Design an enzyme around this catalytic site. Sequence first.
Site, PDB file in Angstrom:
ATOM      1  CB  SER A  79       7.603  12.411  -3.732  1.00 20.42           C
ATOM      2  OG  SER A  79       6.304  11.855  -3.888  1.00 20.42           O
ATOM      3  CG  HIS A 101      -0.862   5.869  -0.142  1.00 24.48           C
ATOM      4  ND1 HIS A 101      -1.328   6.452   1.019  1.00 24.48           N
ATOM      5  CD2 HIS A 101      -1.855   5.059  -0.581  1.00 24.48           C
ATOM      6  CE1 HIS A 101      -2.550   6.017   1.270  1.00 24.48           C
ATOM      7  NE2 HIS A 101      -2.894   5.170   0.315  1.00 24.48           N
ATOM      8  CG  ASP A 102       6.269   6.840  -4.447  1.00 26.47           C
ATOM      9  OD1 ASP A 102       6.366   8.081  -4.281  1.00 26.47           O
ATOM     10  OD2 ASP A 102       7.080   6.168  -5.119  1.00 26.47           O
ATOM     11  CG  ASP A 110       8.385  11.018  -7.050  1.00 29.80           C
ATOM     12  OD1 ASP A 110       7.644  10.541  -6.160  1.00 29.80           O
ATOM     13  OD2 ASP A 110       8.281  12.200  -7.448  1.00 29.80           O
ATOM     14  CG  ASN A 157      -0.300  10.029   2.942  1.00 31.59           C
ATOM     15  OD1 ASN A 157      -0.593   8.943   2.444  1.00 31.59           O
ATOM     16  ND2 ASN A 157       0.297  10.996   2.251  1.00 31.59           N
ATOM     17  CG  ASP A 173     -10.107 -11.877   2.734  1.00 29.52           C
ATOM     18  OD1 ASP A 173     -11.333 -12.113   2.630  1.00 29.52           O
ATOM     19  OD2 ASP A 173      -9.211 -12.642   2.311  1.00 29.52           O
ATOM     20  CG  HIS A 205      -8.776  -3.368  -0.038  1.00 31.09           C
ATOM     21  ND1 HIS A 205      -9.824  -2.467  -0.266  1.00 31.09           N
ATOM     22  CD2 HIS A 205      -7.590  -2.654   0.238  1.00 31.09           C
ATOM     23  CE1 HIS A 205      -9.205  -1.242  -0.178  1.00 31.09           C
ATOM     24  NE2 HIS A 205      -7.903  -1.274   0.098  1.00 31.09           N
ATOM     25  NE  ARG A 245      -3.500   2.375   2.816  1.00 25.79           N
ATOM     26  CZ  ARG A 245      -3.736   3.122   3.895  1.00 25.79           C
ATOM     27  NH1 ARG A 245      -3.007   2.956   4.991  1.00 25.79           N
ATOM     28  NH2 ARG A 245      -4.696   4.042   3.872  1.00 25.79           N
ATOM     29  CB  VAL A 302       1.117  11.908  -4.620  1.00 30.74           C
ATOM     30  CG1 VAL A 302       1.362  13.398  -4.408  1.00 30.74           C
ATOM     31  CG2 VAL A 302      -0.232  11.535  -4.025  1.00 30.74           C
TER      32      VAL A 302
HETATM   33  C1  HEM Z   1      -9.295   1.989  -5.280  1.00 28.23           C
HETATM   34  C2  HEM Z   1      -9.219   2.793  -4.075  1.00 28.23           C
HETATM   35  C3  HEM Z   1      -8.774   2.425  -2.798  1.00 28.23           C
HETATM   36  C4  HEM Z   1      -9.367   2.886  -1.643  1.00 28.23           C
HETATM   37  C5  HEM Z   1     -10.652   3.727  -1.587  1.00 28.23           C
HETATM   38  C6  HEM Z   1      -8.551   2.375  -0.517  1.00 28.23           C
HETATM   39  C7  HEM Z   1      -8.849   2.614   0.824  1.00 28.23           C
HETATM   40  C8  HEM Z   1      -8.167   2.041   1.908  1.00 28.23           C
HETATM   41  C9  HEM Z   1      -8.459   2.374   3.337  1.00 28.23           C
HETATM   42  C10 HEM Z   1      -9.508   3.388   3.829  1.00 28.23           C
HETATM   43  C11 HEM Z   1      -7.632   1.601   4.126  1.00 28.23           C
HETATM   44  C12 HEM Z   1      -7.822   1.278   5.643  1.00 28.23           C
HETATM   45  C13 HEM Z   1      -8.193   2.236   6.799  1.00 28.23           C
HETATM   46  C14 HEM Z   1      -6.988   2.685   7.632  1.00 28.23           C
HETATM   47  O1  HEM Z   1      -6.186   1.821   8.043  1.00 28.23           O
HETATM   48  O2  HEM Z   1      -6.840   3.900   7.888  1.00 28.23           O
HETATM   49  C15 HEM Z   1      -6.780   0.834   3.142  1.00 28.23           C
HETATM   50  C16 HEM Z   1      -5.870  -0.169   3.517  1.00 28.23           C
HETATM   51  C17 HEM Z   1      -5.164  -0.969   2.609  1.00 28.23           C
HETATM   52  N1  HEM Z   1      -5.193  -0.817   1.201  1.00 28.23           N
HETATM   53 FE1  HEM Z   1      -6.357   0.351   0.118  1.00 28.23          FE
HETATM   54  N2  HEM Z   1      -7.504   1.532  -0.958  1.00 28.23           N
HETATM   55  C18 HEM Z   1      -7.604   1.606  -2.371  1.00 28.23           C
HETATM   56  C19 HEM Z   1      -6.738   0.958  -3.238  1.00 28.23           C
HETATM   57  C20 HEM Z   1      -5.704   0.131  -2.844  1.00 28.23           C
HETATM   58  C21 HEM Z   1      -4.696  -0.368  -3.771  1.00 28.23           C
HETATM   59  C22 HEM Z   1      -4.587  -0.060  -5.262  1.00 28.23           C
HETATM   60  C23 HEM Z   1      -3.829  -1.116  -3.031  1.00 28.23           C
HETATM   61  C24 HEM Z   1      -2.640  -1.695  -3.483  1.00 28.23           C
HETATM   62  C25 HEM Z   1      -2.543  -2.566  -4.661  1.00 28.23           C
HETATM   63  C26 HEM Z   1      -4.344  -1.118  -1.645  1.00 28.23           C
HETATM   64  C27 HEM Z   1      -3.800  -1.861  -0.584  1.00 28.23           C
HETATM   65  C28 HEM Z   1      -4.205  -1.727   0.756  1.00 28.23           C
HETATM   66  C29 HEM Z   1      -3.653  -2.479   1.877  1.00 28.23           C
HETATM   67  C30 HEM Z   1      -2.656  -3.626   1.787  1.00 28.23           C
HETATM   68  C31 HEM Z   1      -4.221  -1.984   3.017  1.00 28.23           C
HETATM   69  C32 HEM Z   1      -3.848  -2.296   4.472  1.00 28.23           C
HETATM   70  C33 HEM Z   1      -2.371  -2.058   4.776  1.00 28.23           C
HETATM   71  C34 HEM Z   1      -2.048  -2.184   6.247  1.00 28.23           C
HETATM   72  O3  HEM Z   1      -2.548  -3.135   6.880  1.00 28.23           O
HETATM   73  O4  HEM Z   1      -1.287  -1.341   6.765  1.00 28.23           O
HETATM   74  N3  HEM Z   1      -5.455  -0.259  -1.521  1.00 28.23           N
HETATM   75  N4  HEM Z   1      -7.123   1.108   1.774  1.00 28.23           N
HETATM   76 CA   LIG Z   2       5.281  10.052  -4.980  1.00 29.15          CA
HETATM   77 CA   LIG Z   3      -7.024 -13.203   1.279  1.00 32.95          CA
END
Ligand code: HEM
Ligand SMILES: [Ca+2]
Ligand SMILES: [Ca+2]
Length: 304
Positions: free
Chosen positions: A52, A42-43, A50, A70, A221, A169, A38, A46
Amino acid sequence: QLTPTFYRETCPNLFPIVFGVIFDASFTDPRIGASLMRLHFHDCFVQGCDGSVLLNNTDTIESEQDALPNINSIRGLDVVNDIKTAVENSCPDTVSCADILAIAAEIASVLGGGPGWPVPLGRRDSLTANRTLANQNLPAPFFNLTQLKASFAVQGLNTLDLVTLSGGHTFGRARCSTFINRLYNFSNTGNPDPTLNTTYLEVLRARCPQNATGDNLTNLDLSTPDQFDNRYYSNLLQLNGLLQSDQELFSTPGADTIPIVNSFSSNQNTFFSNFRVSMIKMGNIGVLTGDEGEIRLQCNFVNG
Ligand code: HEM
Ligand SMILES: [Ca+2]
Ligand SMILES: [Ca+2]
């Protein structure tokens, strides 16, 4: 032009080193993998992939780490620096932080049961950061399908790309506040979101009261909390998607993405393959190559 062997001569055993680091860092934290992935996400969205985002606050820079999406959320910049330190002890100032994040995301998948792929490398670190951009580029969970699709377009990613990367996710955590609005008062209706499984709706009200002493954590999950697999798509079929933006991929009358969710939930290998493709595409956004940018010696501050 990014190449997977960009370090063949330069840093022979690059992969082995970083792989070892992330592996030991999991002996005590079965979440660092999802966290690292994740982070790479986030890199890229924005200013570009890079690094950043790893820059801290300076008299000259206002860290993205303080933007709405963030703040109090992303983590693991610590394990990230340990990688740099060990890589440096072998390849003195030759490998970039940017690339390190990209290599971590792939390793994370492999280390969690997911698929692997040859990571194209050769990016260079930036010298700036953009906090406001961060706020206006990363999608929020209360977004509707239309909004989500548009956010991905800005980055040059399509509908398939959107539904494919949401698979991320399939593991990781999320705080109560990020989804609580659909537990008690959705759309000011006074009632729970009608698209959330009623059984799950209970377990969830348990972990997330209607007012407690803080944000509790819960798995994204409920099936396989730490394993990288197509379970995330199966859950949508039974209305067990945790976030609002997750379920919307299946419960949005009209769809367009529904057949894709179905397709994936059926053949996991199918899902697995689109992923490898989608991750590469994302790792190409706003890249700095050749002589552009620099090679940061410390990932939290610019050289000097
Ligand atoms: C399409 C839009 C997406 C939204 C709206 C989104 C939203 C979120 C939110 C709200 C959280 C958890 C709440 C928190 O801990 O503050 C999160 C966690 C996570 N997201 Fe996303 N996400 C998105 C796309 C992605 C993508 C593209 C990836 C990477 C391929 C990703 C990987 C993850 C992972 C692995 C976590 C948990 C990481 C951890 O346990 O520290 N997310 N996401
Ligand atoms: Ca960046
Ligand atoms: Ca799984």
